Amino acid sequence: KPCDTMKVGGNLDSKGYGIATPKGSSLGTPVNLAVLKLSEQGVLDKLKN
Amino acid sequence: KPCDTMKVGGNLDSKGYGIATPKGSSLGTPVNLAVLKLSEQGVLDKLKN
Amino acid sequence: ANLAAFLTVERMIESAEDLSKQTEIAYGTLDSGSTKEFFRRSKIAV
Amino acid sequence: KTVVVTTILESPYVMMKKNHEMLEGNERYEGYCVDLAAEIAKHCGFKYKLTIVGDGKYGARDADTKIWNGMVGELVYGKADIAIAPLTITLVREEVIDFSKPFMSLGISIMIKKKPGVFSFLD
Numbered sequence: 111k112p113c114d115t116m117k118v119g120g121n122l123d124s125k126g127y128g129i130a131t132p133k134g135s136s137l138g139t140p141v142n143l144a145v146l147k148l149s150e151q152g153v154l155d156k157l158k159n
Numbered sequence: 160k161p162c163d164t165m166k167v168g169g170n171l172d173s174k175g176y177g178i179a180t181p182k183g184s185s186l187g188t189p190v191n192l193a194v195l196k197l198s199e200q201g202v203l204d205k206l207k208n
Numbered sequence: 209a210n211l212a213a214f215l216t217v218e219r220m221i222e223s224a225e226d227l228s229k230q231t232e233i234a235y236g237t238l239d240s241g242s243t244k245e246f247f248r249r250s251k252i253a254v
Numbered sequence: 255k256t257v258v259v260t261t262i263l264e265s266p267y268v269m270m271k272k273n274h275e276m277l278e279g280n281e282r283y284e285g286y287c288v289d290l291a292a293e294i295a296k297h298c299g300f301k302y303k304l305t306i307v308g309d310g311k312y313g314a315r316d317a318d319t320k321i322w323n324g325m326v327g328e329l330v331y332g333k334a335d336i337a338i339a340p341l342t343i344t345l346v347r348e349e350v351i352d353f354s355k356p357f358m359s360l361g362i363s364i365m366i367k368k369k370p371g372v373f374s375f376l377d
Contacts (some may be wrong), residue, residue: 124359142348143345143348143349146344146345146348147345149345150249150251150344150345151251152250152251152252155172162368163367163368164365164366164367164368165365165366165367165368166363166364166365167221167222167364167365167366168222168223168224168363168364169223169361169363170360170361170362170363171224171361171362171363172246172361172362173359173360173361174242174246174342174343174344174356174359174360174361174362175342175343175356175357175358175359175360176339176340176341176342176343176356176357176358176360177341177342177343177353177354177355177356177357178294178336178337178338178341178353178354178357179325179326179329179336179337179341179347179351179352179353179354180329180335180336180337180351180352180354181329181330181332181335181351181352182350182351182352184335184336184352186257186298186300186335186336187352187354189297189298189300190294190298190336190354191354191355192297193293193294193297193298194294194354194355194357195355196297197290197293197294197297197357198355198357202293203290203357203358206286206289206290207286207358214377224364227364235364238312239311240311240312240313240314240323240324241311241312241313241314241342242312242342242343242344243362244314245314245344245346246344246362249345249346
């Protein structure tokens with residue numbers, strides 16, 4: 111609110127938001143596993159809600 | 160057909176089908192790029208339809 | 209009056225929780241698959 | 255050079271052609287996964303041979319034997335090299351094999367068993 115507008119029709123393309131890191135970062139390997147662990151735990155659904 | 164059954168409710172969880180390769184495969188790197196090229200081109204939408 | 213009730217009502221189990229609650233109805237999944245593993249490793253109550 | 259391609263007959267992803275008794279080679283298989291594998295090999299340039307799993311299982315692990323079944327057991331144990339199939343991504347399988355970016359999204363769902371009369375005015 112205010113809800114002065116609306117979404118219409120369907121999704122033109124399907125994509126996903128993705129954490130990013132520079133080439134060769136040591137964070138890249140663990141962030142994938144962190145995302146998969148959160149998905150298993152269901153944390154992302156709780157945050158979304 | 161026979162369409163003697165029905166889907167009820169909505170989707171409990173969201174996931175995605177993903178091509179797989181053994182650890183260390185030389186094909187793993189290029190198959191990602193092949194998938195991205197197909198996604199950008201919209202081939203997958205045509206196959207789905 | 210009854211015709212109206214038919215038409216009025218017409219103008220109105222269907223979820224996972226309703227399935228978990230109903231134990232008379234049987235539900236299953238593929239033996240070895242992401243569905244069974246997802247249910248097994250899940251942490252949600254339902 | 256040729257790629258060992260693993261799949262399962264889960265329509266419409268992979269399904270045999272009509273009168274397949276006389277159909278052989280990669281041509282005996284039609285579907286969405288077979289097409290996808292075609293364009294993957296085209297863009298990579300590699301060659302592929304479509305092969306089914308005898309166990310007819312997508313894949314899983316036995317928490318006691320720590321053994322892998324189906325496509326995942328095949329790829330991890332060397333019986334193949336790639337899986338252009340309706341395989342689903344998950345934490346456990348990523349720990350042991352490398353997936354790609356998803357080529358289609360989905361979600362769990364439930365399946366169950368599923369006209370005015372001429373004289374409906376008497377109802």
